Amino acid sequence: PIVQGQMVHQAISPATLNAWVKVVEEKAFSPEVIPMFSALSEGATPQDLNTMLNTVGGHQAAMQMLKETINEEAAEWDRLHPVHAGPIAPGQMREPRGSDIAGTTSTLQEQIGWMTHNPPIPVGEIYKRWIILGLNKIVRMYSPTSILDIRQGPKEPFRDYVDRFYKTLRAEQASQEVKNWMTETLLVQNANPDCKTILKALGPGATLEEMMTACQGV
Amino acid sequence: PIVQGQMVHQAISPATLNAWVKVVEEKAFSPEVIPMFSALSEGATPQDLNTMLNTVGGHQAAMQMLKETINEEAAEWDRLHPVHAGPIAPGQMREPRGSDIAGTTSTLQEQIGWMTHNPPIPVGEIYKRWIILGLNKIVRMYSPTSILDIRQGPKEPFRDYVDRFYKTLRAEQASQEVKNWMTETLLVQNANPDCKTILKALGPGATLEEMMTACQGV
Amino acid sequence: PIVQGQMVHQAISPATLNAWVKVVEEKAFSPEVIPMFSALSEGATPQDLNTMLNTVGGHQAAMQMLKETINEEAAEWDRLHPVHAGPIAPGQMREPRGSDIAGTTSTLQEQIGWMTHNPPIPVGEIYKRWIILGLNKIVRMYSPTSILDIRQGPKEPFRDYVDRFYKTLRAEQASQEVKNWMTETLLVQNANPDCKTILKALGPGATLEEMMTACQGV
Amino acid sequence: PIVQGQMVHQAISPATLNAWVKVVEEKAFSPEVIPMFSALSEGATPQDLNTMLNTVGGHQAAMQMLKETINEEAAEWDRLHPVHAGPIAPGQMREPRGSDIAGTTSTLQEQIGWMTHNPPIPVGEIYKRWIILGLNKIVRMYSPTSILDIRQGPKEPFRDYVDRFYKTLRAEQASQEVKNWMTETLLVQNANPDCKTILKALGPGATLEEMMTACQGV
Amino acid sequence: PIVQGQMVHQAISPATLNAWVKVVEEKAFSPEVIPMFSALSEGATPQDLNTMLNTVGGHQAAMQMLKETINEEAAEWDRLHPVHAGPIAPGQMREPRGSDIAGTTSTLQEQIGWMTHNPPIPVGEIYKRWIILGLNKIVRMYSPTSILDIRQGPKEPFRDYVDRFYKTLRAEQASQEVKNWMTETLLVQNANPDCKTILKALGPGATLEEMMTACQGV
Amino acid sequence: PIVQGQMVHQAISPATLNAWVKVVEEKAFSPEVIPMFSALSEGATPQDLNTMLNTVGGHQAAMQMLKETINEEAAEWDRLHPVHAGPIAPGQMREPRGSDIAGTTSTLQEQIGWMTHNPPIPVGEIYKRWIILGLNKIVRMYSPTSILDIRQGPKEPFRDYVDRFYKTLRAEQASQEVKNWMTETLLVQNANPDCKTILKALGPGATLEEMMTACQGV
Ligand SMILES: [Cl-]
Ligand SMILES: [Cl-]
Ligand SMILES: [Cl-]
Ligand SMILES: [Cl-]
Ligand SMILES: [Cl-]
Ligand SMILES: [Cl-]
Ligand SMILES: [Cl-]
Ligand SMILES: [Cl-]
Ligand SMILES: [Cl-]
Ligand SMILES: [Cl-]
Ligand SMILES: [Cl-]
Ligand SMILES: [Cl-]
Ligand SMILES: [Cl-]
Ligand SMILES: [Cl-]
Ligand SMILES: [Cl-]
Ligand SMILES: [Cl-]
Ligand SMILES: [Cl-]
Ligand SMILES: [Cl-]
Ligand SMILES: [Cl-]
Ligand SMILES: [Cl-]
Ligand SMILES: [Cl-]
Ligand SMILES: [Cl-]
Ligand SMILES: [Cl-]
Ligand SMILES: [Cl-]
Ligand SMILES: [Cl-]
Ligand SMILES: [Cl-]
Ligand SMILES: [Cl-]
Ligand SMILES: [Cl-]
Ligand SMILES: [Cl-]
Ligand SMILES: [Cl-]
Ligand SMILES: [Cl-]
Ligand SMILES: [Cl-]
Ligand SMILES: [Cl-]
Ligand SMILES: [Cl-]
Ligand SMILES: [Cl-]
Ligand SMILES: [Cl-]
Ligand SMILES: [Cl-]
Ligand SMILES: [Cl-]
Ligand SMILES: [Cl-]
Ligand SMILES: [Cl-]
Ligand SMILES: [Cl-]
Ligand SMILES: [Cl-]
């Protein structure tokens, strides 16, 4: 990663490596893995990101899907950023291609140069953006449940049902507005009869805290 | 987080991440989780706070309640701090909205800029204030006992009864004066007959040390 | 905590937090907990000390007693240091009250200012002094044995008896002179007959090493 | 390893040593060991690399093969870089031989000098290149399966079959084009009848995500 | 502890504290504890040394003996270094007493001042010298065996017998010359008949390596 | 150890101490212990090396042999470097004896002075050289097998036999040329009949990779 205020490079630490490896080993592709990854890769160069992706043993279907997503995003970057032929002048650096951002055709020194230039070319955060895109696609693909099937059991406490509902919702492919519709439409509709009656008695503008308080004793 | 004396940024450490994750995994929403959180987020940017909140897997009902609380506080901030339309001048930065403080519509560089400006705009400690508000609401909502039900058993040592009393009291929703009333009224009233007689013999102005010393042999 | 030689602030580390929490979890209020606390809080601000006290879950009777002790010491500080009304001038800081030293009515910046001023106002070491006072009161209150009841068994090796004696003595409420009297009077008196005869044969000015050597084979 | 921006030397850390040793102990010569090694040796001198190779106990057949590969690459370097006889002048350093790059005939100071000179002679990354070459040869030699034998079982979920396929493919000796041919030819051909029919119905240009989605319910 | 080259103070780390505590918990007063202590206290102030001694729970007989030894050494220091009455001048510091070196009557700032002055008054290494003296007395007092009782068994391999011999010898109270006599006299004398015959056949000037090689097959 | 580029001293870390202690506890005197030691002592002063040697509990026969080896090397250093009588001048330091290099008659400051002088007198790397000499003698003395007894079993896979062969060879006392002879003469000679026939069919100049590939299916 890159850290008076001058940005200087630093190698990836054993604690970071082991933390990432253990996270993948234990939690597979649960949603919370994506922020953890993003937490362990703050300020990372494309070389560091490739290091974290390549140290994963197993799950090679998901890693291959991630490669294909990264290749798509790189091809799009090349389509939007055509390269200009010509010799690079002193005081400048070559403009990066898709494969340079993905760390396969650029050196560590070139990545440091792009990331420390003024103005900065943040290849690390771009590559990280692509990687998180692919990881999201994997997380949704490996989710075992659908939000339309989350229904409160006859004896199920309301809190547990809401936990299942919002976990599944966190795994879903939907914009924020579609998720607001799922909350405002499905949550009360799929509650059990007693809880459903009480929640309908609350009103259309009830907060989650008010709903869980209403069905608390139930 | 942000640390000659110049404030410089630093990424969140694997030890911090793992510590927070394990705390949530082991202690759920016991009261002591709130200071621990506040301890692990000293000097954190809104991005770091969002990182710690998003790495929590499960408990998604509580995390959703936390989102709603944060949205309420952000809406209030917008009501009290209306934005002024106009182009930002050199040497200045845009004034933050509620969503900028919550880290969803502001970049890392903007947060660093607000937090390092003179005078400082401490978006991290404001967002942290909102988060701790919501966490308190969760802690009270998930408390299994009420202070009016804590009664000393016939053979229960006075120390254990006081432990239960002040744990439950720590989970309660009450100002400091209401808590002083609960201490001065309920503690002796709900003791067992022998201890209650002795404590009544102490007097109205007895310290906790004197009360536990009086009922020690009992 | 606060660390060319200029004192600069630093957040509390996860290793410190976890170390303190585990110490309290494992050893309750054994004597050796007090130096450990003092070791984990070197250079701590009142905010750090409050962090370490508040992260303790359970033992809330002892924590409440600690609060009452801290309030007493703060009230005494206010009685000895009356505040002077008037506007604070540039180049100065307000003089702290008892609640400012205890970290409940002062900010982090004010504590840093007091602790880095020339001459220094060491609010952290003062608050720490109060806290260690209360912790001592707790340690003595929770000690299960009295020094007058430590008596050597008929087959007990002298070393084990001395271990019990000086552990209990370490838990006792007594000045150093009272402890010298307890050593010079009770240790030999409460030994078993054979050891007692030998130690009486040593003389009044025998060192502990000489006494344990004399009763070694016994 | 070597780290205002001036490159300064630093000893290898116990966390790095232990991490590498445990990786070799647990995962033998699985593919993901090679990036991990490369991650634990960022900025390493030839002395550090020799340290990591020599701390491996057991697997001495593979370590001997690695020695032979390194000797071959060193001999090639000597063939391409003949040494010029003559006294080294002040302000210069001797040009390295193959054994100097491999760390057996050069001192720590000479390696630091080559790696910090302007222009730099990166003996560490060259030696690391040779080492990774030999490690790849070992990984392929110890792979238990061939890509032509990976066939989907009659009840096997498509995801597991793809996992096996791309793990074995990761262990294979083949350029990227040969691997694209293996993907485009063998993956669908060796699927089970139902999945094979569906994938043939997809078309020749199907992405891996589309293929796993098509055979998901199957 | 105290660490451009200017000596600056630093608090004691949780890893140091835990390491020392675990060492005492696991190995009691085996000889190797003394260097470990000395390793964990490099550059320590008397406050740090008192911290490490006071965090030991149990073994209070040995800790009391250590207190008595420290008091003896302090009294001797006072006898050899009489204090001169008079007001301390600007640019000077008071000369330390025995109790100042032992950290009971001096502050942290005074210890830092003595240890950083030119010329330096190394109170930390002096106090450490006293502490190691007392620790040696404890180690010898708690040793269960005597060197005159270490005799090779009839079937005992020579290596194990030498291990026992030199462990016991390491616990002994003897100067280096007395230990050379114990080696040159007792080691061969107390070997078993066969080994003893062979070693006598070696000669008076045999090295330990030659002796263990001679009795290796035996 | 000793680390703008100026060499400054630093105390030995708890992670280094614990790593070394655990290595000795778990692996005794296997060959790979020697590089590990050398890895944990990069830049160490003679005081640090003596610290690592003295913290070893048990194996006191081997530690005594190490003392005798160190004494021999020190005596040789004294024979080759006679001391010159005379008062040391300002701007100079006394030239070290054998016991000064071994850290028994020199202080920490003198070692720092020798190791930081220009030109440097590297007492740490010299002492380390002696220590590694003695450690090698111990490793060879405690090896349970001889290279002339390593013979492939009738059903033994060739890889396992080569592992045993090169482990035992790593423990052997032989120069590199003697080891090349052992490889070129004994490895094929002591293989089982089938493998031996195939390897003889390879030819005299076969690489280890070619030999293990030839006998792979066998
Ligand atoms: Cl995995
Ligand atoms: Cl998953
Ligand atoms: Cl890879
Ligand atoms: Cl850009
Ligand atoms: Cl961009
Ligand atoms: Cl479901
Ligand atoms: Cl509920
Ligand atoms: Cl959780
Ligand atoms: Cl909870
Ligand atoms: Cl998220
Ligand atoms: Cl503000
Ligand atoms: Cl504000
Ligand atoms: Cl209850
Ligand atoms: Cl009680
Ligand atoms: Cl606790
Ligand atoms: Cl207790
Ligand atoms: Cl609190
Ligand atoms: Cl003051
Ligand atoms: Cl004061
Ligand atoms: Cl008792
Ligand atoms: Cl005894
Ligand atoms: Cl291994
Ligand atoms: Cl393998
Ligand atoms: Cl080696
Ligand atoms: Cl080159
Ligand atoms: Cl090159
Ligand atoms: Cl297979
Ligand atoms: Cl599937
Ligand atoms: Cl202990
Ligand atoms: Cl012991
Ligand atoms: Cl104490
Ligand atoms: Cl002195
Ligand atoms: Cl002195
Ligand atoms: Cl014995
Ligand atoms: Cl033997
Ligand atoms: Cl050991
Ligand atoms: Cl061994
Ligand atoms: Cl020693
Ligand atoms: Cl020299
Ligand atoms: Cl030399
Ligand atoms: Cl054998
Ligand atoms: Cl084989």
Author numbering:
A (entry chain A), B (entry chain A), C (entry chain A), D (entry chain A), E (entry chain A), F (entry chain A): 1 to 3, 7 to 221
From the primary publication:
HIV-1 capsid protein (CA) plays critical roles in both early and late stages of the viral replication cycle. CA consists of 231 amino acids that fold into two distinct domains, the N-terminal domain (CANTD) and the C-terminal domain (CACTD), connected by a short linker. Multiple copies of CA monomers assemble around the viral genome to form the characteristic cone-shaped structure of the mature HIV-1 capsid core. The core is composed of ∼200 hexamers and precisely 12 pentamers.
CA residues R18, E28, and K30 are highly conserved among known HIV-1 isolates. They are at opposite ends of the N-terminal domain interface (or NDI) pocket formed by the ends of two symmetry-related helices (R18 and E28 in H1 and K30′ in H1′) from neighboring CAs within a pentameric or hexameric unit. R18 is at the “top” of the pocket, whereas E28 and K30′ are at the “floor”. Indeed, this area has a higher concentration of pentamers, which have been suggested to be less stable than hexamers due to the tighter positioning and greater electrostatic repulsion of the arginine 18 residues that form a tight ring at the center of hexamers and pentamers. In contrast, interactions at the top of the pocket (R18) appear to be more important at intrahexameric interfaces, consistent with the loss of hexamer-containing tubes observed in our TEM studies with R18A. On the basis of the data, it is likely that both parts of the NDI pocket contribute to stabilization during assembly.
